[PDB]
Amino acid sequence: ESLVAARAEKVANLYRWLDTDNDVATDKYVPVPGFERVDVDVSDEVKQRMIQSMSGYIEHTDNQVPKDQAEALATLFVESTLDYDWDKRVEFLTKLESYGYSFEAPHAEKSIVSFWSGKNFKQYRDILDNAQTDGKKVVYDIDVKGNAFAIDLNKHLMRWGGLFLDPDNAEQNQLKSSIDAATFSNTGFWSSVYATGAQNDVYVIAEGGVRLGNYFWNVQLPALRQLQREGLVGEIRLLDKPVSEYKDLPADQIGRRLTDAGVAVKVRFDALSHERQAELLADNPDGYKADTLVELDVKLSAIDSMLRESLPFYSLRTERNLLVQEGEEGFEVRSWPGIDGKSKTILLDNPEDAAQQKSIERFILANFDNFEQMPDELFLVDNKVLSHHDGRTRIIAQKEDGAWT
Amino acid sequence: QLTEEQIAEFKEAFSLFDKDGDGTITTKELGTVMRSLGQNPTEAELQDMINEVDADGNGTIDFPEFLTMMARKMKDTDSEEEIREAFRVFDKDGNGYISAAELRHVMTNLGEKLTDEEVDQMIREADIDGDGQVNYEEFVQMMTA
Ligand SMILES: NC(=O)c1ccc[n+]([C@@H]2O[C@H](COP(=O)([O-])OP(=O)(O)OC[C@H]3O[C@@H](n4cnc5c(N)ncnc54)[C@H](O)[C@@H]3O)[C@@H](O)[C@H]2O)c1
Ligand SMILES: [Ca+2]
Ligand SMILES: [Ca+2]
Numbered sequence: 440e441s442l443v444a445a446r447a448e449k450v451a452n453l454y455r456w457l458d459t460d461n462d463v464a465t466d467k468y469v470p471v472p473g474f475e476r477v478d479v480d481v482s483d484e485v486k487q488r489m490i491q492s493m494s495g496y497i498e499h500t501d502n503q504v505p506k507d508q509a510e511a512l513a514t515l516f517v518e519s520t521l522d523y524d525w526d527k528r529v530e531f532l533t534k535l536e537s538y539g540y541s542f543e544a545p546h547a548e549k550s551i552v553s554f555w556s557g558k559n560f561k562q563y564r565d566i567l568d569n570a571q572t573d574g575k576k577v578v579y580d581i582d583v584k585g586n587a588f589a590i591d592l593n594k595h596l597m598r599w600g601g602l603f604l605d606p607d608n609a610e611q612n613q614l615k616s617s618i619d620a621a622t623f624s625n626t627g628f629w630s631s632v633y634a635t636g637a638q639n640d641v642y643v644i645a646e647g648g649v650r651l652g653n654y655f656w657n658v659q660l661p662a663l664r665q666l667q668r669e670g671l672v673g674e675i676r677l678l679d680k681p682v683s684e685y686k687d688l689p690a691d692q693i694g695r696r697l698t699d700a701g702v703a704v705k706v707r708f709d710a711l712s713h714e715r716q717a718e719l720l721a722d723n724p725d726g727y728k729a730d731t732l733v734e735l736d737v738k739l740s741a742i743d744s745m746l747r748e749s750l751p752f753y754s755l756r757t758e759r760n761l762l763v764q765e766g767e768e769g770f771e772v773r774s775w776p777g778i779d780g781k782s783k784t785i786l787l788d789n790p791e792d793a794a795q796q797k798s799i800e801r802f803i804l805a806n807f808d809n810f811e812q813m814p815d816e817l818f819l820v821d822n823k824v825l826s827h828h829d830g831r832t833r834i835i836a837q838k839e840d841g842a843w844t
Numbered sequence: 845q846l847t848e849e850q851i852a853e854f855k856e857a858f859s860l861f862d863k864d865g866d867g868t869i870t871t872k873e874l875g876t877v878m879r880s881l882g883q884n885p886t887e888a889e890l891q892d893m894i895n896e897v898d899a900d901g902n903g904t905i906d907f908p909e910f911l912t913m914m915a916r917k918m919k920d921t922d923s924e925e926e927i928r929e930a931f932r933v934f935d936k937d938g939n940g941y942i943s944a945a946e947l948r949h950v951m952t953n954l955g956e957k958l959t960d961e962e963v964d965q966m967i968r969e970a971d972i973d974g975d976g977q978v979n980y981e982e983f984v985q986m987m988t989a
Contacts, residue, residue, distance in 0.1 A: 456960070457952075460944035460967060460976060472949060651933065660953050668959055698956050701886025706933065714938045737933050741926040742954040744884055749987040754880055756957030775957055798860070801880055805861045805873075840859035 443542040443585065443632065447529040450631045453665055469525045471627040473657030477620035479521040480610065486521070489599060490514050496595045502588060503538045516592055520621045528628060535585050542585035544578045544636060552637035553577045553644070556655050560644040566682055567642055570690045577642060580633040589629055597622045627658040634662035640673045642694060648679045648703025649739060650732060652710025660697075670778040679703055696757075698743040705732040751796050755803060761810055772817075774810045784816040795819060802835065846915055854914060857881055858907055868904040871897065874913070883917045930954075931980040941977040944970065 457472045458464045470476065481489075493513035497504050504512055512534060519527035536542065544550030551571070560579070567577045580586045600618040604611040641663065643655065650656060666672035676694030678685065679702055685693045695702065708716070709729040719727055727733075746753050752763035752770075762775040763785065770785040789795050799819050807813050814826035822837040835843050846854075861869045861877050869877060871894050878885060885893070893913050897905050905913070934942050934950055942950075944967055952963050969986070970978045 457945070457948060459964075460948060460972070656953065661949070664952050664955070664958075665960070695887065696956055698954055699887070700884040701888060704933075712933065712935060712938050735933060737929050738926050739930055739954055740884060741923070741930040742950070743956055744882070744923060745927050745984060745987055746955060746958070747879075748882065750962070753957065758876060758879070762957075776959060797880075798856075801857055801860045801877075804876055804880060805863060835860070837856075840855055841862070842859075842865055843863055 441533050441536055443532045443536050444529060446542065446632045446635045447532060447628075449635050449665075450628065450662065451525065453631065453635075453662055457661060467525060468523050471624045471631075471658060472661060473652070474624040474627045475620070476523050476624070477617050479614070479617040479621060481521065481614065481617075485614075486517065488603065489517050489596065492599050492603070493517060493592065493595060496592070503540060505538065508534075517596060520593075520596060520625055521617070523621060523624065528625070532585070532589070532629075532632070535588060540585040540588055542583060542632065542636075545582055546576045546578060548638070549573070549575045550578045550638075551575050551640070551642060552633070553579055553642040554634070554655055554659055555579055555644045556650045556653055557644070557646055559646055562682055563642070563644045563678060563685075566685050567690075567693065570685070570688065570693055572690070575690075580630065583633065586629055586633055590626065593622055593625050627654060630654045631658045631662045634659040635666070637663060637666055637672050640690070641675055643675060643677045643697070645677055645679050645697075646681065647732075648705050648734070649677065649697050651704065651706040653707060668776050670776060677702065698740050700738065700740045702739065704735045704737050704739055706735055707731070708733055752800055755800060758804060759807065759809060761803070761807075772810065772813060781810070783810070783813050786816065786818045786820075788820045798837075799824065802841075806834075846911060851911065854881060854911060855907070858910060862907075867907050869910070871903040871905060874905060874910075877910070878914060878917065881914065882923070883914055883921065885917050889917065927984055928981065931984070935980070940981055941975075941979055944972045944976050944978050947978050947980065947983065 451469050454469045454472060455464050458470050461470070463470050468476065490510070490513045493516060494510045497509045497513060498506060512531070515527060515531050515534065518524060519531050532542065544552050551567070553567075564577050564579075568575075596618060600615040604615050606612045606615065645655070660675075663672055663675055667675070675697065677697040678694045707729065708719075708727045708731045711719075711733060715733070715735070716727075719733060743757070747757070752761075755761040755763055756775050760775045762773045762777040764771050764773075764777065766784070769787060769790055772783045772785055773779070774781065785799060787795055787799065799817070802819075802824050803813070803817075814828040816827040818825040818827065823833045824835045825831055825833045835841050857877060857880060858869065859865070861873055874893065875885065875890050893916075897909050931942070931950070932938070934946055936942075947970070948963060948967055951958065951966055952960075955963065966983075966987075967978075970983055972978050
């Protein structure tokens with residue numbers, strides 16, 4: 440069974456899950472989130488040129504493709520790309536795998552699969568590797584050769600549209616845009632395929648803050664959230680501060696959650712609201728390209744505050760990695776995301792009462808660091824909190840405030 | 845200053861963290877206690893507050909010092925307009941609607957400890973229209989209430 444094929448299958452399911460509302464997916468087309476399909480209108484004449492130019496690029500360049508198939512791979516690559524053909528896209532990757540290109544992290548189980556946005560991300564590698572105790576090493580997708588080769592062919596086809604198409608023809612202009620879109624959809628796909636392989640804690644280099652509308656936001660973060668929920672990834676550690684701010688910290692205290700308060704928020708111009716576009720073009724009509732990163736005075740952290748208040752015992756997830764859910768007889772507690780078999784019990788006097796939920800919430804915060812520390816059963820009854828771990832104890836009672844023992 | 849009802853809420857919560865009833869909490873636990881009362885200081889703001897209280901290096905905060913701090917961060921934050929602006933940044937046209945798909949993307953991204961099911965539930969139970977659109981101000985309302 441092919442490694443990259445199983446990755447792609449997982450990505451397909453995530454993409455179809457993100458598309459659950461738009462319902463635009465077919466048997467053949469799976470949409471890349473944030474990367475709309477722009478249909479390609481090409482004659483077979485034009486296609487076979489693209490193919491041969493690509494056949495050429497492979498033929499005489501340093502790579503591991505058998506020269507027999509130089510032309511077959513080209514044809515597959517452009518067809519997969521230009522027809523947005525999901526099956527063929529996977530086939531391409533499978534074939535690269537069959538020539539000895541790995542889509543796995545180079546250091547195996549000691550790889551810290553990590554992510555970047557912006558140009559300075561390489562200078563974070565050394566501070567991060569030296570913070571590790573066990574010889575774990577940071578990898579970026581640029582370090583994995585399968586992704587690197589594919590991204591290479593992908594730049595070729597993108598550039599070929601710049602050279603062989605006169606933009607003064609209306610069609611061939613539209614065409615160059617198509618290539619670009621299809622080209623971007625590839626980069627997205629392969630980004631998710633990389634992200635899907637992440638394990639344990641991971642690093643995201645985003646100096647000066649989280650970026651909305653880019654590859655990490657569109658195709659990598661959703662995949663990381665999936666892996667957290669399967670218990671495969673732990674903490675997503677964002678680094679938004681200069682390298683110097685991470686000195687003399689262990690690996691566990693470097694970076695923070697991208698929904699923590701005080702994380703800055705940059706957005707591509709081409710992802711801003713009309714309201715904010717106008718504002719900026721008023722003062723500077725010319726200094727706003729598509730990729731121009733605009734800092735916004737917004738707190739992404741607010742969304743997590745909302746959830747804190749909307750969902751019972753959410754804060755116990757964020758704070759203590761505990762999942763507390765409605766149960767057959769009251770509340771069940773688990774190690775988030777509730778995936779190991781182990782289960783302890785919270786029983787409440789009045790389980791529907793908000794104030795009683797918060798009381799036991801805050802008691803758990805104050806008394807337990809994690810699941811393992813908790814008694815098999817925790818009661819709150821007539822304003823006493825009790826544990827039951829073969830013996831029963833009432834460790835606190837309320838009389839306008841909380842006293843202990 | 846604060847309301848007496850707020851001082852009360854703050855006391856009841858604090859007291860659970862004051863684990864031998866001397867009127868102090870651990871400095872390590874400040875963020876936690878503030879957050880559980882609906883205030884969300886940055887790591888910078890937390891450090892500031894700690895330094896002001898911990899010159900002597902015992903690493904504890906009085907209950908009056910804790911009220912000062914809650915009061916301070918309460919002035920800075922309007923929870924309502926912070927939640928609005930967050931969602932508004934994904935509203936291309938600014939009419940107060942985004943696509944359901946766009947709302948699924950935002951919530952899966954900006955939900956640290958959601959399950960996939962809870963996201964499904966959020967979108968299921970939202971009032972999506974024939975365009976496939978959702979009023980996020982209403983969405984927030986429903987999630988809050
Ligand atoms: N290895 C690569 O060459 C490569 C390329 C793209 C994306 N990625 C993956 O994604 C992340 C870096 O990309 P990013 O966008 O998050 O960071 P970024 O903001 O630094 O953008 C990096 C590149 O992506 C382009 N880009 C960003 N958003 C785009 C969009 N919506 N449409 C078209 N092009 C867009 C930018 O123009 C730039 O060329 C990394 O985590 C990496 O794994 C890798
Ligand atoms: Ca002190
Ligand atoms: Ca809108």
